[PDB]
Amino acid sequence: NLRGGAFVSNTQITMADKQKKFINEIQEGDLVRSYSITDETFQQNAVTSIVKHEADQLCQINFGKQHVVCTVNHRFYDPESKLWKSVCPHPGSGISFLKKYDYLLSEEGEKLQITEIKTFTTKQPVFIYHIQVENNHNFFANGVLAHAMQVSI
Amino acid sequence: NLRGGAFVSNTQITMADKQKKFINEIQEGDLVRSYSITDETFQQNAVTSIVKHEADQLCQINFGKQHVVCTVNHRFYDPESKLWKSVCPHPGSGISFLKKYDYLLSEEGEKLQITEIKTFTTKQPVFIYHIQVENNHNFFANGVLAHAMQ
Numbered sequence: 397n398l399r400g401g402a403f404v405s406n407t408q409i410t411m412a413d414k415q416k417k418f419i420n421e422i423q424e425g426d427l428v429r430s431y432s433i434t435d436e437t438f439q440q441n442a443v444t445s446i447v448k449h450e451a452d453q454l455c456q457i458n459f460g461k462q463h464v465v466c467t468v469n470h471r472f473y474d475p476e477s478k479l480w481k482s483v484c485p486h487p488g489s490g491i492s493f494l495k496k497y498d499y500l501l502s503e504e505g506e507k508l509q510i511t512e513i514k515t516f517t518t519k520q521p522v523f524i525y526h527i528q529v530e531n532n533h534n535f536f537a538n539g540v541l542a543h544a545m546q547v548s549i
Numbered sequence: 550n551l552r553g554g555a556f557v558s559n560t561q562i563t564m565a566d567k568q569k570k571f572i573n574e575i576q577e578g579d580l581v582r583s584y585s586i587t588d589e590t591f592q593q594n595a596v597t598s599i600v601k602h603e604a605d606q607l608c609q610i611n612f613g614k615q616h617v618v619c620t621v622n623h624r625f626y627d628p629e630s631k632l633w634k635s636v637c638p639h640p641g642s643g644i645s646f647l648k649k650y651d652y653l654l655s656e657e658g659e660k661l662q663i664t665e666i667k668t669f670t671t672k673q674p675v676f677i678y679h680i681q682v683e684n685n686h687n688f689f690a691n692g693v694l695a696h697a698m699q
């Protein structure tokens with residue numbers, strides 16, 4: 397399902413060695429760059445699941461010229477306010493609103509400001525992907541910290 | 550739960566006789582004004598359920614000076630594009646985005662343009678309510694057509 401949201405196929409995932417791979421090429425057992433919010437350290441972790449879905453509703457989040465495209469309900473870490481945030485959080489989920497001028501955390505641990513957010517509907521449904529990542533349950537999508545799908549959700 | 554969304558306690562519901570009652574005063578068996586999209590006719594229908602929740606995340610949808618305050622995932626009928634819409638539709642739900650300059654359907658069948666939408670977080674959780682309405686599964690909240698929890 398799409399309860400944790402999903403990224404478009406050409407979203408780049410930061411591998412453990414800081415190489416970049418498209419999410420649609422990710423496989424179970426792939427080692428990705430991940431982050432433990434308490435230690436404030438970067439750790440490698442295996443992908444334990446990768447699933448392909450479809451949807452026609454997406455949001456583009458700009459941070460400078462760089463951007464990420466995902467379902468409106470994907471969660472991103474704001475390292476300024478130290479909160480997990482989404483453009484469209486479910487009420488009672490405990491996830492905060494993600495808005496223009498909020499911050500994302502880069503794969504090098506820097507605060508990147510969000511300069512623009514837009515929602516749009518594609519003519520046809522496009523392929524989207526969600527992954528599970530052991531231990532830290534997060535990864536870097538186009539260089540910013542995003543939350544991985546969880547079973548406990 | 551809050552999958553269908555909910556309205557704040559001081560949301561006015563149009564009764565069958567076109568009187569207004571606060572959603573927090575609504576009772577099972579109350580007859581409310583409702584709408585069948587196919588017939589394009591107004592019908593009376595009984596509330597079958599009313600539940601009180603809490604949340605601190607809300608959006609305000611303005612249509613002129615009037616507005617409605619609900620969870621971001623509440624569905625409203627746009628009579629211009631003839632689609633059910635939400636500020637924050639769940640992906641794959643088949644609900645379209647509701648945005649500034651879209652349209653709402655008044656309790657008298659008139660298209661009212663949305664002039665502003667904003668999301669905010671309250672200091673403390675507030676009480677919010679969803680209802681079930683037989684047959685048409687909709688009602689008028691501050692005079693605009695809204696979907697009832699299916």
Ligand SMILES: [Zn+2]
Pocket residue numbers: 397398399447449526
């Ligand atoms: Zn899934």
Ligand SMILES: [Zn+2]
Pocket residue numbers: 550551600602679
């Ligand atoms: Zn409920």
